[PDB]
Amino acid sequence: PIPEEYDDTRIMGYDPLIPPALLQNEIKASKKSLETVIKGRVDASRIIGGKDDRCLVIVGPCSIHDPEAALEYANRLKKISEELENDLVIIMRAYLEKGWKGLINDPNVDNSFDINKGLRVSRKLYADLTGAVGIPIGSEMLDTISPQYFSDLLSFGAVGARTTESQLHRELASGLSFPIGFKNGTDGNVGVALDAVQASSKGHHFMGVTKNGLAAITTTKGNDHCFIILRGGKNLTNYDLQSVQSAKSAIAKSSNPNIKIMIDCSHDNSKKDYRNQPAVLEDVSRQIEAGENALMGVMIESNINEGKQSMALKYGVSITDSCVSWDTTVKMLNNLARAVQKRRQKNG
């Protein structure tokens, strides 16, 4: 006789989720939303596959905390996306979590926990970005259960530096309906990202849930639309030319010698300082301007206002990591858009 002190000894409690098929029906994806989602996946895939000379730009706040502040940011970002449509493909970074447990964990930013209210707030936000304004969005892929609530509204997915080697995330990447980007290792390792791209191109079996919320094993087809992201190491930056050449050499000896490179301009490449973000973009832009076709895009941590605060809170200011201003951002995107114009001039 053992009094169930062998099971869930470290589980404070379970909070059952709303079934994804029901959340997808309560907050439905409008036709204009799915039009934006499919267009974002196709436009990004053409740049990844080498069929388009434009640059894929993943720009947005490090984390989304205020839905109304993010919806006003997207209206600014969709305007500039239409003006630079000939050279840039802009996908807004709509990350839900990284002080702040996230939008799915805490919708009211008051340190509570309402996982169901978080899913409705995050999905209705996703439905408004792709529908009300009409801009493609991308999120971070954290587990094998959350994507079942947002996959019909996502056009891009990122696997962080600390999960690129995770076999579970490589399996899930093989079953996601949008292009995936693998960041290099936390020490600057490029090889682990090439291994992730190759592994995710194969069919796999991962443990997820059905649309009704039932534990089930999933059979995947493989994701042939993947790329690597250079975000630097804990002690190094790899956005410079010698580092791109080092990555280009590693790709040439891999199983996918057509892999293109995206450069994170924030995080460790900018020493976590937003003022170095424009100077980092100038370097990669000049590499592109010289005619480097292996360079595919960039990542920009931008916001309505530059800087970072804590959690009575400033409007349009990030709460996590560090962002650049909007007046800064439009210059970064304009300077990059000219570099893309100069690249295809050398390709003519």
Give yes or no for residue 26 binding a copy of itself (CB under 8 A): no
SS3 state at 182: strand
Taking the CA of residue 343 as centre, how many other CA atoms within 13 Å lie in the half-sphere pointing to its CB?
26
For 321, list phi and psi in degrees, rounded to 5.
Answer: 55, -130
CB of 185 to a copy of itself, least distance (A): 8
Tokens representing residue 177 in the block: 């309906």
Q: Which is nearer to a copy of itself, 35 or 68 (CB)?
A: 35
Residues with Cβ within 8 Å of residue 167, at least 6 apart in sequence: 199
Give yes or no for residue 110 binding a copy of itself (CB under 8 A): no
Other beta carbons within 10 angstroms of residue 96's beta carbon come to: 22
Residues 120-159, interacting with ligand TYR (CB under 6 A)? 144-145, 147-148, 151
Q: How many residues bind ligand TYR (CB under 6 A)?
A: 14
H or E, element range at 167? helix 167-173
- 227 in Cβ contact with 259 (< 8 Å): yes
19 binds, among Cl ion, ligand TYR, a copy of itself, none (CB under 5 to 8 A by kind): a copy of itself
Give yes or no for residue 5 binding ligand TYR (CB under 6 A): no
Give yes or no for residue 253 binding a copy of itself (CB under 8 A): no
Give yes or no for residue 218 binding a copy of itself (CB under 8 A): yes
Q: Which of 63, 122, 139, 146 binds a copy of itself (CB under 8 A)?
A: 146
Residue ranges binding Cl ion (CB under 5 A): 204-205
Q: Which is nearer to ligand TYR, 8 or 187 (CB)?
A: 8
147 binds, among Cl ion, a copy of itself, ligand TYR, none (CB under 5 to 8 A by kind): ligand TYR
CB of 129 to a copy of itself, least distance (A): 15
Residues 241-300, interacting with ligand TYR (CB under 6 A)? none
β-bridge partners, 110: none
SS3 state at 159: strand
16 binds, among ligand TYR, Cl ion, a copy of itself, none (CB under 5 to 8 A by kind): a copy of itself
Give yes or no for residue 38 binding ligand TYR (CB under 6 A): no
CB of 272 to a copy of itself, least distance (A): 17
H or E, element range at 58? strand 55-60
**How far is residue 123's CA from residue 197's CA, in Å, rounded to a whole number?**
28
Residues 269-328, interacting with a copy of itself (CB under 8 A)? none
Instruction: Identify each DSSP E strand in 66-185 by its residue range.
Output: 88-93, 137-140, 156-159, 180-183
Q: Which is nearer to ligand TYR, 210 or 245 (CB)?
A: 210
Tokens representing residue 270 in the block: 């900018």
- 226 in Cβ contact with 173 (< 8 Å): yes
202 binds, among Cl ion, a copy of itself, ligand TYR, none (CB under 5 to 8 A by kind): a copy of itself
Tokens representing residue 63 in the block: 């984390």
Ordered DSSP codes for 127-144: HHIIIII---EEEE---S
Give yes or no for residue 99 binding a copy of itself (CB under 8 A): no
Give yes or no for residue 341 binding ligand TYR (CB under 6 A): no
Task: Specify the DSSP class assigned to residue 51.
Answer: S
